Amino acid sequence: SPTQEGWDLTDKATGLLELNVAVNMGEPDNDFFQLRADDLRDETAYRRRIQSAA
Amino acid sequence: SPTQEGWDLTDKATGLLELNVAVNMGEPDNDFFQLRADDLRDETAYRRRIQSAA
């Protein structure tokens, strides 16, 4: 806000001003892999890949 | 007080003197603004301006 001195303030009132800032977003981050059915007989690699992705 | 030396001191009596300091005021300090009634449909800027003024 601005300010002002004195008693008589006639025709010296100010207006308001409020400023702003924008926030935006980018592109998603992915881990994306493919796996055949027979490769899921042993599930350690799949789970470890999930943890390392996190 | 003054201080004086000797025995006689005749015709050398002093007077009394007390000094003064004056405190006064200044001009009033103001935040003064104008708004049309259409600007008060959303009054958030008005309240935030009041806070800024304080």
Numbering used by the authors:
A (entry chain A), B (entry chain B): 55 to 108
Quote from the publication:
The structural changes of the capsid were caused by the conformational changes of gp5. The tip of the F-loop transformed into an α-helix (residues 36–42). In the A-domain, one of the two short α-helices extended from residues 172–177 to 172–184 and the flexible loop (residues 190–208) became an α-helix and a fixed loop, resulting in the closure of the sixfold opening in the procapsid. The P-domain and E-loop tilted, resulting in a thinner capsid shell. The I-domain was largely unchanged, except for a minor shift of its D-loop. The salt bridges between E81 and K249, as well as those between D246 and R255 in the procapsid, and the hydrogen bond between W48 and T46 were disrupted due to the conformational change of gp5. For example, E5, E15, and E159 formed salt bridges with K31, R42 and K216, respectively, in a neighboring gp5 subunit in the mature capsid.
Approximately 250–300 copies of scaffolding protein gp8 and 415 copies of coat protein gp5 bind to each other to form the procapsid in the T = 7 laevo icosahedral arrangement. In addition to the conserved HK97 fold, gp5 has a distinctive nonconserved domain (insertion domain or I-domain) that is inserted in the A-domain. Here, we report the cryo-electron microscopy structures of procapsid, empty procapsid, empty mature capsid, and mature capsid of phage P22 at resolutions of 2.6 Å, 3.9 Å, 2.8 Å, and 3.0 Å, respectively.
